[PDB]
Design an enzyme around this catalytic site. Structure first.
Site, PDB file in Angstrom:
ATOM      1  CG  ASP A 169       2.056  -8.397  -2.372  1.00 19.63           C
ATOM      2  OD1 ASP A 169       0.990  -7.975  -2.849  1.00 19.63           O
ATOM      3  OD2 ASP A 169       2.092  -9.340  -1.563  1.00 19.63           O
ATOM      4  CG  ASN A 211       0.353 -11.987  -4.295  1.00 24.37           C
ATOM      5  OD1 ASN A 211       1.011 -12.471  -3.380  1.00 24.37           O
ATOM      6  ND2 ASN A 211       0.205 -10.684  -4.459  1.00 24.37           N
ATOM      7  CD  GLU A 255       4.252  -7.932   4.474  1.00 23.40           C
ATOM      8  OE1 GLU A 255       4.494  -8.420   3.350  1.00 23.40           O
ATOM      9  OE2 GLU A 255       3.230  -8.210   5.133  1.00 23.40           O
ATOM     10  CG  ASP A 283      -4.441 -12.318  -6.800  1.00 25.99           C
ATOM     11  OD1 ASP A 283      -3.270 -12.005  -7.106  1.00 25.99           O
ATOM     12  OD2 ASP A 283      -5.072 -11.739  -5.896  1.00 25.99           O
ATOM     13  CG  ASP A 288      -8.422  -0.730   4.420  1.00 23.34           C
ATOM     14  OD1 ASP A 288      -8.300  -1.164   5.591  1.00 23.34           O
ATOM     15  OD2 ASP A 288      -7.976  -1.343   3.427  1.00 23.34           O
ATOM     16  CB  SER A 344      -2.189  -9.056  -7.297  1.00 23.19           C
ATOM     17  OG  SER A 344      -1.981  -9.947  -6.221  1.00 23.19           O
ATOM     18  CG  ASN A 351      -2.151  -7.027  -3.898  1.00 22.43           C
ATOM     19  OD1 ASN A 351      -3.237  -6.928  -4.475  1.00 22.43           O
ATOM     20  ND2 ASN A 351      -1.337  -8.059  -4.076  1.00 22.43           N
TER      21      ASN A 351
END
Ligand SMILES: [Cl-]
Ligand SMILES: [Cl-]
Length: 129
Positions: free
Chosen positions: A52, A46, A35, A48, A101, A50, A59
């Site tokens: 990271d 990203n 990562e 959209d 989650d 967003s 994110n």
């Protein structure tokens, strides 16, 4: 901070990540390698809007607030900048919330594509743990 492999393994083990939700320490080290290349300061934007952040590339749409992702949920209740610190505590505590989650470590694309189903113990071999 750019961690060494064994240095990061030992820090993650100290913060309770070894076998957290059944994921052996080697999974976490493998996910950090691909990562962020073990760099706490890593960021990536990203499509959209967003971003990271940090060693585990958490994110900004769901988990932290960076003030520029509209509709951010900020579920870890932290500024995203706190995830870039040399102290990995904030990234660890947030990742514990993410891996709980429902989707496990599949939340990390690089773990799914480059660690899942491999010999992840190889990432901690040689380390004094
Ligand atoms: Cl392991
Ligand atoms: Cl799971």
């Amino acid at each position: 901070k750019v961690f060494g492999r064994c240095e990061l393994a030992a820090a993650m083990k100290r913060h309770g990540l070894d076998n957290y939700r059944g994921y052996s320490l080697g999974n976490w080290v493998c996910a950090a390698k691909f990562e962020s290349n073990f760099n706490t300061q890593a960021t990536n934007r990203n499509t959209d809007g967003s971003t990271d952040y940090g060693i585990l590339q958490i994110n900004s749409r769901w988990w932290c607030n960076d003030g520029r992702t509209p509709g951010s949920r900020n579920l870890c209740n932290i500024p995203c900048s706190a995830l870039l610190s040399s102290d990995i505590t904030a990234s660890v505590n947030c990742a514990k919330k993410i891996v709980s989650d429902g989707n496990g470590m599949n939340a990390w694309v690089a773990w799914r594509n480059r660690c899942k189903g491999t010999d992840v113990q190889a990432w901690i071999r040689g380390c004094r743990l």
